[PDB]
Write a protein that binds this ligand. Structure first.
Ligand SMILES: COc1ccc([C@H](Cc2cc([N+](=O)[O-])ccc2OC)c2c[nH]c(N)n2)cc1F
Length: 372
């Protein structure tokens, strides 16, 4: 089972992964970004230069107008829409059709990306961060309530046309290897977690573990990079720099501005360190760590192989984005309020190193790593 859902994700590097969904009756097909960093089901519902398709409510016999608007400011830009409901389904997902809240995006400024394969967003986080308020039930919540699909989904984000799998309602064994280790979901808004220790090539970053989670640490498929707090990013980069000093790179590379290139097939992966995040475990004083390779944080972008540094600075806490998720099979066990990590069956590595998920490790005062 779940074979119907395997490989149901596609994507364009740096733009996220999208699943195919249909909305309305008769069904209208759209590509919806899979975002565990937001909680709205929003879709383009009016003409736009970047949208080559859009939700046409007037053509759905099953549409219902909630007669309420929503205004979402996004960085330097925004989107606005009319809230409503309609029948939604996932062609390559569970065989269910559900009535869900839909934010019909009717106006936007600097939101939709020029030439992006997706026309909407599927916010899989919790209601607390749903716009305009926590009373707009997130899609996955309606899905679970209206069907018998277990309260759980898993993501295998593979990279370099990127692809992956979103398994709704189960765990597909062929998507990972070894063990799944679970970290508790600290609070149900974002998929917030607690990082209790960071290593660069085995060397402890040695910071107040509260810094790692300041002001929070989330798992966000809607973010490309691994984004770390300023103090943490600064330390991580210093350490990553030291670890790879056999070659020097322009300060622009460490800022994600400049690229770094090598003769096709000669990328010096080994001079780059691995990165380990220790996550709070399910058992007392027990943690586990997930380790990613340069193949994860060096985003491929001629007859050379060129890459961009995919670790960047955050002011809104740690974001375990695609850079992290692409090394692992990530299980969002909402039912049990925990997130599973297993080595991904599709992650990119070489013959000497591999992403890892190891445990347990004795760790005291893990609660103290949580920032308030
Ligand atoms: C409910 O309101 C929003 C939901 C999601 C986003 C973006 C989605 C997005 C993802 C990627 N992407 O690269 O996956 C690129 C561009 C995007 O928006 C244009 C986002 C930001 N962070 C998260 N989790 N998602 C912005 C919103 F205003």
């Amino acid at each position: 089972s779940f074979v119907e859902m395997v490989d149901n994700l596609r994507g364009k590097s740096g733009q996220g992964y999208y699943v195919e969904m249909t909305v309305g009756s008769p069904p209208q097909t759209l590509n919806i970004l899979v975002d565990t960093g937001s909680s709205n089901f929003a879709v383009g519902a009016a003409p736009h230069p970047f949208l080559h398709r859009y939700y046409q409510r007037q053509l759905s016999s099953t549409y219902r107008d909630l007669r309420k608007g929503v205004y979402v400011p996004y960085t330097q830009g925004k989107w606005e829409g009319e809230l409503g409901t309609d029948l939604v389904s996932i062609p390559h997902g569970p065989n269910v059709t559900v009535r869900a809240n839909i934010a019909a995006i009717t106006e936007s400024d600097k939101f939709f990306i020029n030439g992006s394969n997706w026309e909407g967003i599927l916010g899989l986080a919790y209601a607390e961060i749903a716009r305009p308020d926590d009373s707009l039930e997130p899609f996955f919540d309606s899905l679970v309530k209206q069907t018998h699909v277990p309260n759980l989904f898993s993501l295998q984000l593979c990279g370099a046309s990127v692809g992956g799998s979103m398994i709704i309602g189960g765990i597909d064994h062929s998507l990972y290897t070894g063990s799944l280790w679970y970290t508790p979901i600290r609070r149900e808004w974002y998929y917030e977690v607690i990082i209790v220790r960071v290593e660069i090539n085995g060397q402890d970053l040695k910071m107040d573990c509260k810094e790692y989670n300041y002001d929070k640490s989330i798992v966000d498929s809607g973010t490309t990079n691994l984004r770390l707090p300023k103090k943490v990013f600064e330390a991580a980069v210093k350490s990553i720099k030291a670890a790879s000093s056999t070659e020097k790179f322009p300060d622009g590379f460490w800022l994600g501005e400049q690229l770094v290139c090598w003769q096709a097939g000669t990328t010096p992966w080994n001079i780059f360190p691995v990165i380990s995040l220790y996550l709070m475990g399910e058992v007392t004083n027990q943690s586990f760590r997930i380790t990613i390779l340069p193949q994860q944080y060096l985003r491929p972008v001629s007859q050379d192989d060129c890459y961009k540094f995919a670790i960047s600075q955050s002011s809104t806490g740690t974001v375990m984005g695609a850079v992290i998720m692409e090394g692992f099979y990530v299980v969002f066990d909402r039912a049990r309020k925990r997130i599973g990590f297993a080595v991904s069956a599709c992650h990119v590595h070489d013959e000497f190193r591999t992403a890892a998920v190891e445990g347990p490790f004795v760790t005291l005062d893990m609660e103290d790593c949580g920032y308030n």
